[PDB]
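Record Peptidyl-prolyl cis-trans isomerase NIMA-interacting 1, 117 aa.
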Amino acid sequence: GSHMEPARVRCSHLLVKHSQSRRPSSWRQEKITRTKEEALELINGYIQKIKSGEEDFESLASQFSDCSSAKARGDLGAFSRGQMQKPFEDAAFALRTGEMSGPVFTDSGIHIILRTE
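=>
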């Protein structure tokens, strides 16, 4: 008598892209020439800060996300399943209040998912 995964969850997301993509363009830089390994270093760097509580995810997502989502704070409030990608959904809906998925690798870049609520 339980629901298969939550129906709606709130999770904030950060996106770091890399050269290997169909569009290596950012809002803070023209051509993203950073390779995957460089992106990994960046991602892991934030992942540690998020656990230790060095910098706030909202501030990170609003600055380090190559996507326009940075200006959207990085948070999308409570979202349903049919709003996110398959890998994102699996990770986001598997995070409880305080959990962080980490590096979600997609073709459009690496997404960091943190359960804010």
